[PDB]
Design a protein around this nucleic acid. Sequence first.
DNA 1: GAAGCTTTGCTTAATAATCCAC
DNA 2: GTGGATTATTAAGCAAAGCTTC
Length: 114
Amino acid sequence: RATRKAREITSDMEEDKDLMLKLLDKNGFVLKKVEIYRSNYLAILEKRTNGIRNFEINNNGNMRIFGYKMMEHHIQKFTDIGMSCKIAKNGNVYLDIKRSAENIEAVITVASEL
DNA sequence: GAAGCTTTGCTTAATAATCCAC
DNA sequence: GTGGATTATTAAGCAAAGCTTC
């Protein structure tokens, strides 16, 4: 038989990832490395700040922020611009929002003014 | 539609880093 | 600086779902 594909990365995703890296280096975000895990680009921060651990551009059409024990009033600032949030029992924070040049910029700007 | 493979998303366990009273 | 614990980061684990071929 055959395996699953699994799932493509589109040209839009690379550019969006390019923009993320562009804005992170622009906003002084130091990256440990970039990973592809489950067909996703993960810019893993070496120095986690304000509980944020890495910035991700996922194939589901969303941009996500992965953190640990972030302050709620910090999380609220991200939810204030339309991002959803689910906090796990262990303190992990999951922030999601639809990919777009405007939304990616707004998310990183907020993270930079944190 | 179901079996048998996979990926996928996340939790839980395991390893490494940080406190704090002596 | 150490003993002895708690907490944070990395690796393994698990249920749910997707392809692919029945």
